[PDB]
Paper text:
To further advance our understanding of Csh adhesins, we next sought to elucidate the X‐ray crystal structure of the NR2 domain of the CshA paralogue CshB (residues 211–528 of the full‐length polypeptide). Despite repeated efforts, only the dimeric form of CshB_NR2 proved amenable to crystallization. The crystal structure of CshB_NR2 reveals a strand‐swapped homodimer, wherein residues 442–528 of each monomer are buried in the central core of the associated dimer partner. The exchanged region comprises β‐strands 12–14 of each polypeptide chain. Monomeric CshB_NR2 adopts an overall fold equivalent to that of CshA_NR2, with a Cα root‐mean‐square deviation (RMSD) between the two structures of 1.0 Å. The CshB_NR2 fold comprises a β‐sandwich core formed from two antiparallel β‐sheets, one of eight β‐strands and the other of six β‐strands. The periphery of the β‐sandwich is decorated with six α‐helices, which are located between strands β3/β4 (α1 and α2), β9/β10 (α3, α4, and α5) and after β14 (α6). In contrast to previous crystallographic studies of CshA_NR2, electron density was observed corresponding to the CshB_NR2 polypeptide chain beyond the final β‐strand of the protein (β14). This density corresponds to an extended loop punctuated by a short α‐helix (α6), which traverses the connecting loops between β6/β7, β8/β9, β10/β11, and β12/β13, and occupies a groove formed by the packing of α1 against the larger of the two β‐sheets. The CshB_NR2‐binding pocket is appreciably less negatively charged, predominantly as a consequence of the substitution of residues Asp300, Asp337, and Asp338 in CshA_NR2 with tyrosine (Tyr288), methionine (Met326) and asparagine (Asn327), which occupy equivalent positions in CshB_NR2.
Numbering used by the authors:
A (entry chain A), B (entry chain A): 1 to 92, 106 to 171, 178 to 298
Write the structure that this text describes.
């Protein structure tokens, strides 16, 4: 994974230390093997020929804008009130390998020319890409290539779910209006993959998707006669409750009324960022 | 895990098929081993003595409300406009083991009296609990017990992160105002665990937390001279890009200008819910 935080790897940055057309990133990633990235374009997906073809002949054909610029969602309060950020790697270890557009509520893109050399000779590179952040159904990251069509390599720890129109519309109703869908300058349904099964494997466009493997922490209490579950959420949470019976043999009849009637014992106050030591 | 969807396991439901005080859930979970849950209370966390003690002697002491009822966040548009739902298991396999309050934007709780019998004799149960849903820093699930203080058992696939005041305030600024924190009837900072390290292990109150292990899907392209990355998000996404060099030996010089200059090949249209078969 490239370390975009290494400031000496960058040349020809803008006034704010961010990318412009002609910015380069160069790294000798292995002895003799040099990769050079050059910024060719800084434009969002609604400016691409890919998007032009997806909206052709529909009600939203006019949303194709080849002159579109990186910036805020037009529904955001930032739009027109504050300059948008620059694309940057400048930490400003998970962060080090990320290239970001460091404000919320945006529609942006970058296209890089890539060159790899091995002992000074040009070679065909093998490029891997991922979104380092989590994505809900209204959060889109799309990958394009002019090389081989995308091949799934596996999961990187910090098969998956392709975002569909139904998932996006369900998320819109659930949140009572996603900010992104309030931007009427783009047809967001045409950001979604045409391939609802694999999200673009074996094509030159991958995503947008969301990772599908989550876990939940499990806790245990023994000798309870009362358990409570409390929720406050803009969404929904859900109770799971189970019982273990493997050790019933030597289980007591009860932990006792004396134990059960003590007031609920709250957790100790422990905040090491506030108070590093007990003494 | 209890199957709350089994309608015959429930007795004494309300008019809408949901829980009321005195509703029971009964299951013979293993031969001879019967668990009975009885609803003792349907009230949110701001009604508890736990919460009373956390706000005592502060500016928000008046937010303790022993007469509070389950219902919507007072900042939600639903509040006072539509009746709140009932707690229910009624599917209305991951869903089957969940007890839910099936509308968004709520502050609710349930307390159960628990009895376990083995061949008709009362026994001390071993109870496990989890939140079946994902939680962002403004989504709270809290577990209470009058049995042994909570012990961490591990992760259930569908160590963790305790939500802190800093995380909640960062999420508030990131989203430009969480709906939950707009409800001024509760001191949400006193829903957070006093124990920022473990979130209440070895106490009778666990959570609120969020699961900390995510993965990201990785794709690969070979022989690219151009790669693009496009984002649209109410939040932020991030590009990761890497190179593999293991097979440089037999790597070609180039995939060719002829290949590289073909227009970007979009993904095929494949939607099996719309069109189950090609023919």
């Amino acid at each position: 994974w490239l370390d975009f935080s290494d400031s000496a790897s960058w040349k020809n940055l803008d006034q704010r230390g961010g990318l412009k057309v002609g910015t380069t990133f160069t790294k000798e990633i292995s002895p003799g093997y040099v990769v050079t990235l050059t910024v060719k374009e800084l434009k969002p997906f609604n400016s691409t020929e890919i998007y032009k073809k997806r909206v052709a002949g529909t009600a939203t054909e006019g949303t194709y804008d080849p002159d579109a610029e990186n910036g805020f969602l037009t529904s955001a309060p930032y739009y027109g009130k504050t300059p948008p950020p620059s694309v940057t790697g400048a930490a400003q270890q998970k962060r080090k390998t990320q290239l970001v557009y460091p404000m919320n509520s945006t529609n942006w893109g970058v296209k890089f020319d890539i060159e790899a050399t091995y002992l000074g000779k040009r070679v065909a590179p093998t490029v891997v890409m991922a979104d380092g952040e989590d994505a809900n159904p209204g959060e889109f990251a799309i990958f394009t290539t002019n090389g081989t069509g995308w091949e799934y390599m596996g999961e990187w720890k910090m098969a998956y779910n392709v975002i569909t129109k139904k998932m996006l519309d369900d998320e819109d109703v659930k949140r009572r209006g996603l900010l992104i869908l309030k931007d009427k300058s783009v047809d967001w349904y045409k950001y979604l993959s045409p391939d609802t099964v694999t999200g673009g494997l074996g094509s030159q466009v991958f995503g947008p998707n969301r990772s599908n493997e989550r876990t939940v922490p499990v806790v245990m209490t023994r000798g309870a006669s009362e358990v409570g579950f409390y929720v406050a959420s803009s969404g929904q949470q859900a109770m799971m409750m189970g019982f273990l019976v493997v050790a019933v043999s030597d289980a007591p009849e009860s932990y006792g009324e004396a134990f059960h009637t003590i007031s609920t014992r709250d957790s100790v106050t422990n905040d090491p960022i506030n108070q590093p030591y007990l003494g």
